[PDB]
């Protein structure tokens, strides 16, 4: 009963391992970018070109 | 037709010189009223719409509700007996043609010009027209520059002076190749 137990525990084991431990590589794509603000500081042109 | 409802006073103006004299008349006195049937009650109870003009002689005349008459014939296109809708409605049909995902942004950028459009109090009650027909949740917001009458030729003069726009005049040597109908080619 214990060697079919730890069977199924030690093949649980590596895909646990795999699941989880590989998710450390990297998980700080949550973090936004800046996404900042004006402030009324981007009105510094005029109505001279608009095509470029 | 303000020329025709001005002889509901007296004023008879029919020489083809005179017509500039009405058509100043309208430019100086004329203007669109927010609510059309307010504004035809008060006319017609007090007098503090008559406004009077000098002709190019003397004889003063009296305005009394043609103030008001006149430039409503564009949203009620009925009184001089054309069958379409006003300017408030062929809009919102022009809208409406357009594909689903871009009627917001129309919404929101509506455009005045020409100079019919200058008669003082238009911006408001094409606005509250729109508002009235269009969906409750857009947001409805309409452009009126101050120089409206010279819009087009602003626009002209800077379309002729980008330098992208430099290679598409109809040169000389392709009209004397392919003849007038040149113009509804590629170069447009």
């Known amino acids: 009963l214990g060697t079919r137990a730890k069977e199924s525990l030690d093949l649980r084991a590596h895909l646990k391992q795999v699941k989880k431990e590989d998710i450390e590589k990297e998980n700080r794509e949550v973090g936004d970018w800046r996404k900042n603000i004006d402030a009324l500081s981007g009105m510094e042109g005029r109505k001279k070109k608009f095509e470029g | 037709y303000l020329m025709k409802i001005l002889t509901e006073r007296g004023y008879s103006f029919v020489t083809t010189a005179e017509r500039e004299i009405v058509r100043d008349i309208k430019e100086k006195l004329c203007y669109v009223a927010l609510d059309f049937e307010n504004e035809m009650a008060t006319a017609a109870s007090s007098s503090s719409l008559e406004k009077s003009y000098e002709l190019p002689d003397g004889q003063v005349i009296t305005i009394g509700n043609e103030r008001f008459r006149c430039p409503e014939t564009l949203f009620q296109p009925s009184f001089i007996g054309m069958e379409s809708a006003g300017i408030h409605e062929t809009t919102y049909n022009s809208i409406m043609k357009c594909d689903i995902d871009i009627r917001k942004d129309l919404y929101a950028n509506n455009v005045l010009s020409g100079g019919t459009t200058m008669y003082p109090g238009i911006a408001d009650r094409m606005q509250k027209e729109i508002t009235a027909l269009a969906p409750s ?36 040597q392709e009209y004397d190749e392919a003849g007038p109908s040149i113009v509804h080619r590629k170069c447009f």
């Open chain 2, 137 to 172: 949740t857009m947001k409805i917001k309409i452009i009126a520059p101050p120089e409206r009458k010279y819009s087009v030729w602003i626009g002209g003069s800077i379309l002729a002076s980008l330098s992208t726009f430099q290679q598409m005049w109809i040169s000389k």
